Design a protein around this ligand. Structure first.
Ligand code: NI
Length: 341
């Protein structure tokens, strides 16, 4: 059965609630983004209206084969009326097509659902600036002060400089980047751009990227692996065994692999600086873990919430343990006492 934190009170609406069968009273199912924990349950046999961004709707049609008549794409930054209630979709700074949803309830209550997001000061000059928010349904993935990581720009500068150095030293080195979902495309696009290459990948991944409305994409990617010196592989193949196997397949074109694993936060963040990160190496293979996050750090989260000043917070992540829930409630009260709302 559907948990309360996926329901929008005073409406017929649910958010990211596709794995519960028919939810009683739900007239429109919102999907914030195309990540499997959030779309879990959707298939080609789903027969209720789904409301989402254009990019998410492209993925629903081409990858999940949801039929067109049930997909309702909405433009961003635009007041829309759904089932008699005003909504706005805002960019979540997560993966391609990811949104936050503002609901303007008939009784005057305003609710923001962040979906998954990476809070940013630019959000303080969206349509959120214009009115008060009573209830915040919040992506609390990294809601504890130990969760620190660099900006996305610092992490990409590290990856560009590492790849450009290695390949300039050895023109016969291949670069490989792991992937298992949409998001984090800047990692492999930025490296291919510094190396003057397209990015090579499987037909299935090419198909997915062709749904994302990325400008000039046809100039940036390919299914011809032979022509490319940056390859994408499934994240599960980013280990010494998988990479050896891949180098075999390249027919002696290359004699070295430099590989990147974009992770979220890892405990090595509590000690090391990005500048100081080193790889794991075995022979002619090296593997870098790089902390490229598409969720808020603790500090980014706290700044957003202290700016927005909501009357009530409903967490949407880490809700399964009493210890997690108590920790998050303590920080919410700190933030509120510190800022005075
Ligand atoms: Ni996500």
């Amino acid at each position: 059965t559907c948990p309360f934190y996926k329901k929008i009170p005073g409406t017929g609406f649910t958010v990211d609630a596709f794995q519960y069968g028919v939810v009683e009273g739900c007239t429109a199912y919102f999907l914030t983004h195309f990540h499997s924990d959030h779309y879990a349950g959707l298939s080609k046999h789903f027969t209720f209206p789904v409301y989402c961004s254009e990019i998410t709707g492209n993925l629903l049609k081409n990858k999940l084969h949801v039929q067109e008549q049930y997909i309702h794409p909405l433009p961003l930054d635009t007041e829309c009326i759904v089932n008699g209630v005003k909504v706005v979709l805002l960019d979540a700074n997560h993966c391609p097509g990811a949104v936050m949803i503002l609901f303007y309830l008939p009784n005057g209550t305003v609710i923001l659902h962040t979906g998954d997001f990476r809070a940013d000061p630019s959000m303080e000059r969206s349509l959120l600036a214009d009115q008060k928010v009573h209830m915040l349904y919040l992506d609390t993935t990294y809601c504890s002060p130990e969760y620190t990581f660099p900006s996305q720009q610092e992490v990409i500068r590290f990856a560009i400089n590492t790849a450009f150095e290695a390949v300039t030293l050895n023109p016969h080195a291949l670069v490989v980047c792991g992937t298992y979902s949409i998001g984090k495309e800047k990692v492999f696009l930025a490296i291919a751009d510094v190396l003057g290459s397209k990015v090579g990948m499987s037909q299935e991944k090419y198909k997915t990227l062709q749904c994302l409305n990325i400008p000039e994409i046809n100039s940036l990617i390919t299914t011809d692996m032979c022509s490319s010196l940056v390859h994408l592989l499934p994240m599960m193949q980013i280990n010494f065994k998988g990479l050896q196997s891949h180098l075999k397949k390249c027919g002696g074109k290359y004699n070295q692999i430099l590989a990147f694993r974009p992770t979220g936060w890892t405990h090595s963040n509590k000690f090391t600086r990005i500048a100081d990160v080193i790889p794991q190496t075995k022979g002619n293979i090296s593997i870098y873990g790089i902390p490229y996050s598409e969720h808020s750090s603790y500090l980014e989260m706290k700044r957003f919430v202290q700016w927005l000043k909501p009357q009530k917070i409903i967490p949407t992540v880490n809700v399964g343990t009493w210890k997690s829930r108590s920790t998050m409630e303590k920080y919410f009260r700190e933030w509120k006492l510190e800022a005075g709302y």
